[PDB]
Design a protein around this ligand. Structure first.
Ligand SMILES: CN(Cc1cccc(F)c1)S(N)(=O)=O
Length: 460
């Protein structure tokens, strides 16, 4: 039975509005409704992994698991295994997998982050799950961010707190947050970004939605505009939105948007908005293709419609050779030439690099670089030809060209990371000097760049 080189992943996000679901929710898991929808000919084909994020979920874990498992069994005739379930208040994540995958999955982690302070601590935050699927690390975050059209900055703050403090994946990757720990990271939820147009334009917006003319609305979507100004979700992707806004509906129909201010809304308008989103970030040159992104039309218990996204995602096998794991394979090496970091920091300390990768027995510390002043004010840290030669555990190119090297640039004075990035070993050539590049981030904000050349030796 061969190990897969691809799997499909279903991501669902639904703010349930504190109401039980209707008796049938299969349209959600089938990616049917509005937007980029799944072909009917695929309906019986199970996804490999289903990740369900809910917000304002009134159900017990048991109650929701029974609904989810029975739904998938009706669609696929497969009884899915429960990988993980984690709930913070009314924010929940469930991971289900085909039974054939049970012994491909390991290192299952769950965590949560509560956002805000005092007033603003008590119902917003995130839950997440991570695990290994054979040689591939997968992370999943379901976040319910701060509500309200005039709180985009708070949402951006909520995002940074979640990616700093959610403790998922390999704890040995100590300098790296969740935005660097996974081959594929999926972040979804009620992100609560709104269409920023005047209140007086509410009926105009509704008109535009009835015409399926989303362009002038999406140009005011706060998540798109904040992401274009590099304020949030830097280096994440989102599929084009081709479905109507998923909030705020009158319950038990989808014919009416309920946008007017009410005591129940704290006298706030809720103009139609794309609150409910799915984004991802995968390591460079790993296969990931969005195959659906849309909303259901037939699930109407909530003031939100469910959102679905499906993905093809490249995966690798748990590689064994006669040498590694448990030793190095002297036929393999990774060399770095003419490397330098450019940092935005105003500080003057010495810097060194750490190289982290599951192709190494453990992480590698470099010598300190040489600081110079850049022509436009910047700190340039030069490593020249001084970087250590990295000794991978396995030299086979079928393994090594699929791996990645995480880089942290750290202060010698404090040992704190000033920037993190990732280099793919999926090179155009081996035994050949080739350009490499990564942006560097810290707390998910841009802090610099790392560039240079790589020379990869494999057993071929
Ligand atoms: C048996 N584990 C993985 C798993 C647990 C539950 C459901 C699964 F589909 C897979 S393990 N290797 O101990 O983490």
């Amino acid at each position: 039975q061969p190990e897969p080189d691809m799997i499909t992943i279903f991501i669902g996000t639904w703010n349930m509005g504190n109401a039980p679901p209707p008796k049938k929710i299969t349209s959600w898991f089938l990616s049917k409704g509005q937007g980029k929808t799944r072909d009917d000919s695929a309906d019986y084909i199970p996804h490999d992994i289903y990740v369900i994020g809910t917000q304002e979920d009134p159900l017990s874990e048991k109650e929701w698991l029974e609904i989810l498992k029975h739904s998938l069994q009706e669609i696929t005739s497969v009884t899915f295994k429960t990988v993980a379930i984690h709930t913070l208040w009314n924010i929940r994540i469930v991971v289900l997998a085909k039974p054939e995958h049970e012994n491909r999955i390991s290192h299952i982690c769950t965590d949560n982050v509560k956002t805000g302070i005092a007033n603003t601590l008590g119902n917003k935050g995130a839950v997440g799950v991570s695990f290994m699927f054979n040689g591939t690390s997968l992370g999943f975050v379901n976040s319910h961010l701060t509500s309200g059209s005039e709180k985009k900055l708070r949402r951006n703050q909520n995002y940074m707190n979640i990616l700093r403090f959610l403790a998922l994946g390999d704890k040995k990757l100590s300098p790296f947050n969740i935005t660097h720990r996974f081959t594929h990271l999926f972040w979804f939820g009620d992100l609560n970004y709104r269409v920023d147009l005047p209140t007086w334009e509410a009926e105009t917006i509704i008109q535009k939605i009835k015409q399926q003319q989303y362009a002038d609305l999406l140009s005011h979507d706060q998540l798109l505009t904040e992401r274009r100004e590099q304020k949030v979700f830097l280096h994440f992707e989102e599929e084009e939105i081709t479905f109507a806004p998923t909030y705020r509906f009158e319950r038990l129909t989808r014919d009416k948007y309920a946008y007017t201010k009410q005591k129940a809304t704290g006298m706030k308008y809720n103009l139609p908005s794309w609150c409910d989103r799915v984004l991802w970030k995968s390591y460079p040159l790993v296969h990931v293709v969005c195959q659906s992104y849309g909303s259901t039309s037939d699930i109407m218990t909530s003031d939100h419609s469910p959102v679905f996204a499906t993905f093809e995602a490249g995966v690798t096998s748990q590689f064994v050779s006669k040498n590694g794991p448990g030793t190095v394979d002297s036929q393999g090496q990774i060399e770095f030439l003419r490397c330098y970091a450019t940092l935005k920091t105003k500080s003057q300390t010495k810097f060194y690099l750490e190289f982290h990768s599951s192709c190494l027995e453990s992480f590698v510390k470099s010598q300190e670089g040489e600081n110079e002043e850049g022509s436009e004010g910047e700190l340039v840290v030069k490593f020249g030809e001084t970087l250590p030669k990295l000794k991978p555990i396995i030299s086979d190119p079928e393994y090594l060209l699929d791996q990645h090297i995480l880089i942290s640039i750290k202060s010698s004075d404090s040992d704190e990371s000033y920037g993190e990035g990732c280099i793919a070993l999926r090179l155009e050539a081996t035994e050949t000097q080739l350009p490499i590049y990564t942006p560097l981030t810290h707390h998910g904000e841009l802090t610099g760049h790392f560039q240079g050349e790589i020379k990869l030796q494999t057993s071929q």
